[PDB]
Design a binder for this molecule. Structure first.
Ligand SMILES: CC(=O)N[C@@H]1[C@@H](O)[C@H](O[C@@H]2O[C@H](CO[C@H]3O[C@H](CO[C@H]4O[C@H](CO)[C@@H](O)[C@H](O)[C@@H]4O)[C@@H](O)[C@H](O[C@H]4O[C@H](CO)[C@@H](O)[C@H](O)[C@@H]4O)[C@@H]3O)[C@@H](O)[C@H](O[C@H]3O[C@H](CO)[C@@H](O)[C@H](O)[C@@H]3O)[C@@H]2O)[C@@H](CO)O[C@H]1O
Ligand SMILES: [Ca+2]
Ligand SMILES: [Ca+2]
Length: 428
């Protein structure tokens, strides 16, 4: 089969932060090659219609003139690694649209008889390309650790993400979660639904002013989903129930122009096993939902809190978790761990409970330990302007290690449901 060589993913999201992006396309080999092993790759524009139909997506084709393969797309065989690869360059173009995902479907062609291609799936990989050159204010560089922040939107305006910058002006928090919409039972439909409390609903209704300004500066905004004290839950949907709920989550992220989801399996009660949308609570059911959610929004982030039964099964329908868990964050005091072919670049190395105090600090020591451990993420939960003294104290020193620039003292904060930047601390 064919995949992206750097990530080893068959579906790879590419964020352009500069004028070019370089990678390889890699064909895996089933036998040690010989002098005759050969293959080429090409862009397969016709396959995009098939892909979009299968995923209920609408991606446009990235301009083919902006994509270049080395060596006319002929793959260089590496006999020692059972693979063959070609360099591919993606150039940023003109006349592209901000905030639109484009597709580069790549196909194997002209392969030698020693290569067996099982199906059309193994014959293709896909790059999902986003131009992020202008939504650059959270982008702190190649290979740095990234931040993941939950807001308790019952109480705190997520525009407070903008209170957190390094001295070099970059935004600290790459990803923020609106915590949380709920899963609840819909009796009229006999199935689960997304249920948004009035605070969540107000944010979505007002996404233009209270959420999209974060996305304009490059922050990914995710909808949090959380159990909510009835028979439905994120780790207890049947295969069919998970397919249906995943489509609803994807519809929210499309309707409100968000960047994905966090799943937190807490507070559900026991399921009604006679209901066909439900099943025994388990990590396999949770993994099924994550997989189906990714199939429904392959260019958006599927992330989990490692608690309850939400995380741990590493394959669904033969597909490894690297393809459908983008980020896993752990409980306060723990580091997350990868499953399947994930690496610790998908995992949090610290989780900080900013409202109650546990989980430690993003100190210089801790930052270096996390880098040394290969972690990709640091997580924080429930910051608020009233506690900025404590929150920012727990961020002292780490930024110099992670980025060469410490977190700056806050000077602005936002009040709930109010777009006005107030002066910190004078305005409270
Ligand atoms: C990523 C992560 O940290 N995940 C979790 C967090 O959930 C947890 O946060 C804390 O969670 C507790 C428990 O919240 C759940 O239970 C609440 C109480 O439910 C019961 O009572 C209700 C009546 O008061 C009944 O209606 C209900 O049926 C049940 O009998 C419940 O109110 C809460 O749901 C609300 O909040 C969530 C978002 O948090 C929202 O989706 C719901 O729609 C609803 O609005 C949960 O079901 C909670 O008590 C903690 O709350 C305190 O702290 C927060 C700030 O963090 C304050 O805003 C709040 O005022 C309280 O002071 C907090 O939310 C964290 C930390 O423990 O850890 C992981 O477990
Ligand atoms: Ca800009
Ligand atoms: Ca808790």
């Amino acid at each position: 089969y064919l995949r992206d060589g750097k990530s080893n993913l068959v579906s790879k999201v590419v964020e352009l932060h500069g004028e070019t992006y370089a990678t390889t396309v890699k064909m895996g080999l089933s036998k040690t090659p010989n002098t005759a092993t050969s293959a080429k790759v090409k862009i397969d524009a016709a396959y995009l219609e098939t892909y979009n139909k299968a995923h209920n997506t609408d991606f446009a084709l990235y301009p083919q003139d902006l994509v270049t393969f080395a060596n006319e797309g002929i793959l260089t065989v590496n006999a020692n690694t059972k693979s063959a690869e070609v360099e591919m360059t993606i150039r940023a173009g003109e006349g592209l649209q901000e905030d639109k995902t484009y597709a580069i479907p790549v196909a194997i062609s002209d392969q030698s008889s020693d290569i067996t291609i099982k199906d059309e799936d193994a014959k293709h990989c896909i790059y999902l390309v986003k131009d992020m050159r202008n939504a650059g204010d959270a982008y702190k560089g190649e290979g740095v650790m990234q931040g993941y922040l939950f807001f308790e939107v019952n109480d705190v305006n997520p525009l407070n993400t903008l209170s957190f910058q390094l001295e070099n002006g970059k935004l600290l928090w790459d990803v923020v979660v609106l915590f949380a919409a709920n899963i609840n039972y819909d009796a009229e439909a006999g199935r689960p639904r997304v249920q948004c409390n009035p605070n969540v609903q107000y944010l979505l209704d007002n996404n233009e002013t209270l959420l999209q300004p974060l996305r304009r500066r490059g922050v990914k905004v995710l909808l949090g989903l959380l159990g909510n004290h009835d028979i439905t839950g994120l780790a207890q949907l049947s295969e069919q129930g998970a397919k249906d709920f995943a489509r609803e989550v994807a519809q929210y992220c499309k309707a409100y122009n968000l960047d994905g989801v966090n799943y937190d399996d807490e507070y559900s009660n026991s399921p009604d096993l006679s209901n066909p949308s439900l099943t025994n609570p388990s990590t396999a059911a949770a993994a099924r939902l994550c997989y189906e959610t990714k199939q429904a929004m392959p260019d958006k982030l599927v992330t989990v809190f490692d608690w309850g039964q939400m995380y741990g099964v590493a394959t669904v329908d033969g597909v490894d978790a690297k393809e459908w868990i983008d980020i896993v964050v752990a409980n306060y005091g723990s580091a997350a761990y990868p499953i399947g072919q994930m690496t610790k670049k998908q995992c949090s190395g610290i989780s900080m409970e900013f409202n109650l105090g546990g989980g430690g600090s993003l100190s210089a020591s801790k930052a270096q330990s996390m880098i040394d451990g290969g972690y990709g993420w640091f997580m924080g939960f429930a910051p608020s302007p009233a506690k900025y003294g404590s929150v920012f104290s727990r961020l002292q020193g780490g930024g110099e290690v992670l980025y060469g620039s410490n977190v700056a003292a806050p000077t602005i904060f936002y009040k709930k449901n109010d777009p006005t930047p107030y002066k910190y601390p004078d305005d409270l």
